[PDB]
Design a protein around this nucleic acid. Structure first.
Ligand SMILES: [Mg+2]
Ligand SMILES: [Mg+2]
Ligand SMILES: [Mg+2]
Ligand SMILES: [Mg+2]
Ligand SMILES: [Mg+2]
Ligand SMILES: [Mg+2]
Ligand SMILES: [Mg+2]
Ligand SMILES: [Mg+2]
Ligand SMILES: [Mg+2]
Ligand SMILES: [Mg+2]
Ligand SMILES: [Mg+2]
Ligand SMILES: [Mg+2]
Ligand SMILES: [Mg+2]
Ligand SMILES: [Mg+2]
Ligand SMILES: [Mg+2]
Ligand SMILES: [Mg+2]
Lengths: 104, 122, 147, 52, 52, 129, 187, 127
RNA sequence: CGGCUACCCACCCGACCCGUCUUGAAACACGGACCAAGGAGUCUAACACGUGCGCGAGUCGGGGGCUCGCACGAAAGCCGC
RNA sequence: GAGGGCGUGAAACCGUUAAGAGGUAAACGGGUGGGGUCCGCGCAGUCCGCCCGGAGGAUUCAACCCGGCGGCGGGUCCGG
């Protein structure tokens, strides 16, 4: 959430829950245990303020000064799609599948 | 992003049981037990799985919708089939083969349905 | 990371990775840099040539404050000022030139390098090498001193 | 008591990890593979009203 | 870059007409090395001298 | 006569002795666990005949039949119903075995669910009333 | 006994890339597939340079990557770099050229697009040129790495030209005995 | 969740203050709940105990519907003694049996001026 | 009826008591009566090199300041005139 | 089988019972044999699963269409 107004008093003692602001994020809260992918519930003003706070790849972040979004290594990365697109399979040798085991 | 999700989930994920020997994926919509890539239920855009009906009679089949991801309330559409075991085995064969939807894992769905029907009968 | 340390793997061996015969005791050769003339000269010479002796005049109370003269090259000389200026001043405007003041950026002495484009400029610095002065008069700009 | 307890991370990596964790929170197959229960939950990135 | 819409769920749980475009942080790359590394070093930051 | 799994051959073990530590017979402050003798004089390291045999990679068992019970299954430990139901697909090669700290009240429910799913449980009749 | 020949068959090559990075592992999967299904040696070299470590993928500079494409016959050929690209501050004017490389920096992408170019990543490079037709592979300055100016037979004895280790390059630090003729000897 | 910086979550300090609290705190610790009809009548959850109440046991070996009178209160042992609850020894001498006052339901009070004042403070604070 | 087993016994052959200094140990070389618990390459600074990550001719906030007094907050976040 | 230094009670060691053994001090490794405790197996009656040809009843699919929902796959990129 952003703009604290009393949501902390409401959600505070429901057990196991985490209440956490936008402009002060935590890796220790957004990925507890060093595993990625913690479930999250957002808010309207928070979810609008995210793109102001980190930007797109086209415009820089406005609230954080020198920071852009990261570079992206593989642009499209469905490996099955890439291998079964015709541009690769035009240029493949052959499926060689005879086993040719040991002959006594 | 299926391979990204696989390179994150293939180790260090939840479920995953490694106990005295080999790994058992134990995903809650899976065909076989093997933590493998072809037999994956969470990650793929198109997935097939079977489960027992809570009534006790018949086999329910869960097929992923493909119409929208990021919406798991509607992502899995479920049907119930209660037949003479041969008509339901042929029915799941038709529903896999005559659709484009996962031409692999025919026999995974078939063997799991066959085992659950034999376990269900006496 | 004691679990990744070598020492946890080295258990069960008697000498713990220092030999039975040699026996790492306390301080075999000495301490620190013992024997710089006497018995480590084959290391000190052949691995640190010049370690012993005096060379220069003795200068007392030196300040690294009076001799402060950073350098800037004719490669870097453009990007002290935004590239919009060199584009507009290079778009055949008139005989005029932009003034690039390196003392604003924090550089006192302009050294010469290569590749100065033909676009004429005016550079203000405290010091100039005759290389860079020749390069500026060759591209057609001028040298200006300050104080 | 002078053991090197605290460690410093670069701020760009501190922000990179936040971006990576938020990006991993968007995919449904990742977060079910941690152990939450999103089986009967609407959309992944939940966004309620400001009345909350 | 594919930027879908997200429908804002009301407090009753029904999707309203209000829609916010998904920000690019939910399209950022996903790096478990860097998440695990920075998580380790921040856990090292969260402790005291301890029984000496 | 329970379930009779798939084709399991005549297993060979290459030695069935679980090799003893040198001079563990002479003392009782040396437990029976193997440990590589690294002495400078030790006859076990010098491999004199008539002394004990060091374990090494030659004694290893066949990869076809590694971790095989004599009944013909490979063992797999289990605590409860879901981890029993993971073996619903592969029962004819992998037997289940209920952990030691499972109580009897849940243990009989596990063995009953295993009897429905036809999965071999190697200790089914222990800890009952 | 069999071989009185020594044992030194096991080559010290890098089979799996030692990094744990997921995107690099996926590129390894794809280019290993291409190197065993296409029989083009370009795929072999790209696969080995993807295996290769952080040091031996040194960053290309934009001016050198311009100069190697200003050579006669390489205008339409895409300059492919394994490793990263740094933007250069030296040169002013950049031509149109297409570059496929890992992790191009922000200012370098900026001035390539200001020149009007097109960059690509290796998935797009595979979808365009699987045998790598019309591609020129470039390499970075490995010996320009500053650690390689400490390595020689000595730091001083047959002139050696190899920069001894010292704290601060001034007077009174390693200048006196054996570096000048009036004090003892000279090299 | 604890929000004061001047009260302990600490197990050692809590057990130590518990087993060494003096008598005028041990009175507050040895407290009993009132029966639900009496809490309807008086609007108060709990009270300290004294020598002269009428007491029913809710759990133990001695359970249910035996409304007897307390006789002694060992605050040193955190134990009250009830008049009906007995047990013989080997030698045929009866002895009271220890009941902690959390397992105790009060059915009648002893009315006194300070008990009226405490009861009125409870009702006024519950408001 | 089948059974390996750290059960016991029989028999044939091999079979010297371990640790270390040592060119040489079964040594008429030294230490060890037996058993349980404790018991030894840690930490900091500095340097060199290899490795992994981020940014890139830059990079680094490790010193301060900024946020409401909230367990986890001695955290985390931000500064860039 | 918690009896006032009293939870759990290991080893060295000792007593007793049960088994076996005894001239080259005892102990060990390889190889077997004999006995014992105990496990499994049902003890010349133990194999199972599928398909096909035969002897019974009891059900209702299916083949065919109607009705309905959901999903697959493509097209005018129609409608946006
Ligand atoms: Mg060794
Ligand atoms: Mg030494
Ligand atoms: Mg020797
Ligand atoms: Mg040989
Ligand atoms: Mg050798
Ligand atoms: Mg304490
Ligand atoms: Mg000596
Ligand atoms: Mg001698
Ligand atoms: Mg010896
Ligand atoms: Mg001795
Ligand atoms: Mg002695
Ligand atoms: Mg110990
Ligand atoms: Mg380094
Ligand atoms: Mg006890
Ligand atoms: Mg006791
Ligand atoms: Mg006898």
């Amino acid at each position: 959430y952003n703009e604290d107004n009393g949501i902390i008093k409401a959600f505070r003692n429901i057990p196991g829950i985490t209440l956490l602001n936008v402009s002060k994020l935590n890796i220790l809260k957004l990925a507890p245990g060093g595993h990625v992918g913690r479930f999250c519930i957002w808010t309207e003003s928070a979810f609008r303020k995210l793109d102001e706070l980190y930007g797109t790849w086209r415009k820089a972040a406005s609230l954080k000064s020198n920071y852009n979004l990261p570079m992206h290594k593989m642009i499209n990365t469905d490996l099955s799609r890439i291998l079964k697109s015709p541009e690769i399979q035009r240029a493949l040798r052959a499926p060689r599948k005879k086993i040719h085991r040991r002959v006594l | 992003s299926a391979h990204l999700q696989w390179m994150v989930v293939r180790n260090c994920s939840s479920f995953l049981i490694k106990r005295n020997k080999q790994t058992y994926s134990t995903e809650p919509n899976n065909l076989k037990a093997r933590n493998s890539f072809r037999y994956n239920g969470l990650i793929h855009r198109k997935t097939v799985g079977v489960e027992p009906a809570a009534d006790g009679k018949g086999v329910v089949v869960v097929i992923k919708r493909r119409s929208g991801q990021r919406k798991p309330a509607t992502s899995y559409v479920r049907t119930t089939i209660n037949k003479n075991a041969r008509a339901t085995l042929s029915s799941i064969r038709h529903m896999i083969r005559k659709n484009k939807y996962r031409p692999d894992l025919r026999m995974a769905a078939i063997r799991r349905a066959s085992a659950i029907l034999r376990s269900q009968k006496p | 990371p004691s679990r990744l340390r070598k020492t946890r793997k080295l258990r069960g061996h008697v000498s713990h990775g220092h030999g039975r015969i040699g026996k790492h005791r306390k301080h075999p050769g000495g301490r620190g840099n013992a024997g710089g003339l006497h018995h480590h000269r084959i290391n000190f010479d052949k691995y640190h040539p010049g370690y012993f002796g005096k060379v220069g005049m003795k200068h007392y109370h030196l300040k690294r404050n009076q001799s402060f003269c950073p350098t800037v090259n004719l490669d870097k000389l453009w990007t002290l000022v935004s590239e919009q200026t060199r584009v507009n001043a290079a778009k055949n405007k008139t005989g005029a030139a932009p003034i690039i003041d390196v003392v604003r950026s924090g550089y006192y002495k302009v050294l010469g390098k290569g590749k100065l484009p033909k676009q004429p400029v005016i550079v203000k610095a405290k010091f100039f090498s005759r290389r860079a002065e020749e390069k500026i008069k060759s591209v057609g700009g001028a040298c200006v001193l300050v104080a | 008591t002078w053991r090197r307890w605290h460690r410093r991370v670069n701020t760009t990596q501190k922000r990179y990890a936040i971006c990576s964790a938020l990006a991993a929170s968007a995919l449904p197959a990742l977060v079910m593979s941690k152990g939450h229960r999103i089986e009967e939950v609407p959309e992944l990135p939940l966004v309620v009203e400001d009345k909350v | 870059c594919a930027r879908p819409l997200i429908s804002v769920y009301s407090e009753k749980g029904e999707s309203s007409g209000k829609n916010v475009t998904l920000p690019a942080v939910f399209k950022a790359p996903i790096r478990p090395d860097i998440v695990n590394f920075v998580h380790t070093n921040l856990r090292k930051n969260n402790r005291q001298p301890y029984a000496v | 006569a329970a379930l009779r799994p798939l084709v399991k051959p005549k297993i060979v073990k290459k030695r069935t002795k679980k090799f003893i530590r040198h001079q563990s017979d002479r003392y009782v402050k040396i437990k029976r666990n193997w440990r590589k003798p690294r002495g400078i004089d030790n006859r076990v390291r010098r491999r004199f005949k008539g002394q004990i045999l060091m374990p090494n990679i030659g004694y290893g068992s066949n990869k076809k039949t590694k971790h095989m019970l004599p009944s013909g299954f490979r063992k797999f430990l289990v605590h409860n119903v879901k981890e029993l139901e993971v073996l619903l697909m592969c029962n004819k090669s992998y037997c289940a075995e209920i952990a030691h700290n499972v109580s009897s009240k849940n243990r009989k429910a596990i063995v009953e669910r295993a009897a429905q799913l036809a999965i071999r449980v190697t200790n089914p009749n222990a800890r009952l009333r | 006994g069999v071989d009185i020949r020594h044992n030194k068959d096991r080559k010290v090559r890098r089979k799996e890339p030692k990094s744990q990075d997921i995107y690099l592992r996926l590129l390894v999967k794809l280019y290993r597939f291409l190197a065993r299904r296409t029989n083009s040696t370009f795929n072999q070299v790209v696969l080995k340079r993807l295996f290769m470590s952080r040091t031996n993928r040194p960053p290309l500079s934009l001016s050198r990557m311009i100069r190697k494409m200003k050579l006669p016959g390489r205008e339409n050929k895409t300059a492919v770099v394994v490793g990263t690209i740094t933007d250069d501050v030296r040169v002013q004017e950049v031509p149109k050229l297409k570059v496929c490389a890992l992790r191009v920096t922000s200012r370098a992408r900026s001035r390539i697009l200001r020149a009007g170019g097109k960059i690509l990543t290796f998935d797009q490079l595979a979808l365009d040129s699987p045998k790598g037709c019309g591609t020129v592979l470039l390499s970075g300055p490995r010996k320009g790495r500053e650690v390689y100016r400490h390595f020689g037979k000595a730091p001083g004895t047959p002139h050696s030209h190899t920069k001894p280790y010292v704290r601060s390059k001034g007077r009174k630090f390693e200048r006196a005995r054996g570096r000048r003729a009036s004090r003892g000897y000279k090299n | 969740m604890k929000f004061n910086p001047f009260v302990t979550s600490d197990r050692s300090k809590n057990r130590k203050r518990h087993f060494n609290a003096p008598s005028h705190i041990r009175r507050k610790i040895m407290s009993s709940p009132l029966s639900k009809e009496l809490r309807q009548k008086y609007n108060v959850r709990s009270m300290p105990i004294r020598k002269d109440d009428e007491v029913q046991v809710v759990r133990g070996h001695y359970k249910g519907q035996q409304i007897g009178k307390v006789v002694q209160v060992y605050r040193k042992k955190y134990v009250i003694y009830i008049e009906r609850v007995q047990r013989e020894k080997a030698n045929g001498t009866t002895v009271h049996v220890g009941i902690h006052p959390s397992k105790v339901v009060i059915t009648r009070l002893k009315l006194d001026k300070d008990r009226k004042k405490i009861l009125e403070r409870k009702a006024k604070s519950r408001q």
